[PDB]
């Protein structure tokens, strides 16, 4: 193909490499799934070794790991801290509660899955999913944003 197309593809690879090697989650959790999330932070699995480091403010966050039961009282707050994240942001639902309500699906005060509130990039199943499974979801998200072709789509526009 064109020489400029190759340059654009390599720039896409570089941008995707940077964004997948530096994934900072918001220090945000709701329940037992967030307990497994800090067990992923624990020395056995070392998200920091993978380059994944928690940041407290949503402004410095890249991904949002919805780890727990999203209730009706919590949903505006979750939407607010999602909206306050800057644009290259991703969402990892974790556990059956955040996926589709889970054990509290038919409850009066539970949002039936956080995908009703925020656009979810990756769903991690389990109750709780193990820290292995959450780490697998993080690596799958890294592959997904490695697959992104933003500058190539912009060039083909």
């Amino acid at each position: 193909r064109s020489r400029a197309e190759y340059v654009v593809t390599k720039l896409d690879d570089l941008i995707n490499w940077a964004r997948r090697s530096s994934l900072w989650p918001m220090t945000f959790g709701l329940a037992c799934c967030a307990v497994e999330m800090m067990h992923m932070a624990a020395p056995r699995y070392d998200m920091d070794r993978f380059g994944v480091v928690f940041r407290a403010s949503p402004r410095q966050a890249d991904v949002m790991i919805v780890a727990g039961t999203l209730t009706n009282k919590m949903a505006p707050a979750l939407r607010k801290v999602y909206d306050q994240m800057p644009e290259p942001r991703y969402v990892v639902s974790m556990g059956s509660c955040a996926n589709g309500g889970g054990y509290y699906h038919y409850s009066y005060s539970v949002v039936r899955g956080c995908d009703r509130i925020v656009p979810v990039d990756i769903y991690v199943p389990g109750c709780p999913p193990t820290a292995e499974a959450l780490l697998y979801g993080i690596l799958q998200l890294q592959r997904k944003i490695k697959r992104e072709q933003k500058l190539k789509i912009w060039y083909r526009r």
């Binding site: 059956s96 054990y103 990756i122 199943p125």
Partner: protein, 178 residues
């Protein structure tokens, strides 16, 4: 019985040596230095970090992972549409519809498990009288859409066909306990 965690018994009085020891403790930061030494020892230890995904954390044959539907060695489905798993499912994550098959066998026409609704508790696999539904040890089945976690009978039978070499071995290692 009970014990005191902070109450001190009697007094140590006052001595020049004890006063000098407390003065050196305050001025020279002795407990801070030994905390530094503890962190230094941890630095020179060996980390407990495995090399995921090339190394996996240990598990047991009892592990409750992705659901699957098993078969007899003849290839006939083990499930007989008895809805015990559906009855005992605490999250109501199982939907079962059934009818007699063309040969008159009692088989399901719909076996759906909402893995976004399931709580991964194993009540289905411990209520199944024929060991049809199991939680095989797969846990790395995260998807990118909510729909792909809504399993039906074809997905569960494909999981049972995929993981039969491991599920059968786990049930062989486990069934004497249960």
């Amino acid at each position: 019985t009970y014990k005191y965690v902070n109450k001190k018994e009697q007094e140590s009085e006052v001595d020049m040596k004890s006063a000098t020891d407390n003065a050196a403790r305050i001025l020279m930061w002795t407990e801070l230095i030994r905390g530094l030494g503890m962190t230094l020892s941890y630095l020179f230890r060996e980390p407990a970090t495995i090399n995921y995904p090339f190394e996996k954390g240990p598990l047991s044959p009892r592990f409750r992972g992705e659901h699957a539907l098993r078969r007899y060695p003849s290839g006939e489905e083990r499930c007989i549409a008895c809805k015990l798993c559906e009855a005992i499912c605490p999250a109501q994550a199982i939907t079962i519809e059934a009818e007699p098959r063309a040969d008159g066998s009692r088989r399901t026409t719909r076996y759906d498990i909402d893995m976004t609704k399931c709580i991964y508790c194993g009540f289905c696999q411990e209520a199944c009288p024929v060991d049809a539904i199991v939680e095989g040890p797969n846990f790395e089945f995260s998807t990118e859409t909510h729909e792909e976690l809504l399993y039906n009978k074809e997905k569960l039978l494909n999981n049972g066909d995929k993981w039969e070499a491991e599920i059968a071995a786990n049930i062989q290692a486990d069934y004497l306990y249960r």
